[PDB]
Amino acid sequence: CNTCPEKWINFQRKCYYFGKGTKQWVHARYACDDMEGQLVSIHSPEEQDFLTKRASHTGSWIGLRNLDLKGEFIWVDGSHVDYSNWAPGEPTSDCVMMRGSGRWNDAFCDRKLGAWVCDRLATC
């Protein structure tokens, strides 16, 4: 399965949308939902590398958040963290962003970032 909607990019069995324009995290979450995807989940180094190659230099929202501040970071699709790419010292805790390096930072959810990444399953 490697088919994606127009404007989305395939990697492996998924499709990705590199969104641009100011969003706080929840607004990015809904922006992805409006296009029938979700804020991206990341489950391998190879997926991460694909994303880093396209990462906004001024940071991007991804689909990880410290749910109900129950203290566990969980992906928006409900999957759990098995792969991680935290920047040194992170998480400091919120909502998670990807730096230009691809590394992750937990941040205030009301922070305004210029980019955000969505995913969905590729069709076959």
Q: Which residues bind Ca ion (CB under 5 A)?
A: 92, 105-106
Q: Return the sign of the alpha-carbon dihedral for residues 116, 95, 41, 48.
A: positive
What sign results for the dihedral spanned by CA atoms 11, 54, 83, 31? negative
92 is in an annotated binding site: yes
Instruction: Judge whether 34 is annotated as a binding position.
Output: no
| Chain position whose Cβ is nearest to Ca ion | 92
Burial code of 74-96, b = ≥16 C-beta within 10 A, e = fewer? bbbeeeeeeeebebeebbeebbb
123 is in an annotated binding site: no
Give the residue with the Cβ less far from Ca ion, 16 or 61: 61
* Shortest distance, position 31 Cβ to Ca ion, whole Å: 22
Question: Which CB atom, from 85 or from 105, has the smaller least distance to Ca ion?
Answer: 105
Identify whether the C-beta of residue 85 lies closer than 8 Å to the C-beta of residue 42: yes
Residue numbering of the annotated binding site: 90, 92, 105-106
Residue numbering of the annotated binding site for Ca(2+): 90, 92, 105-106
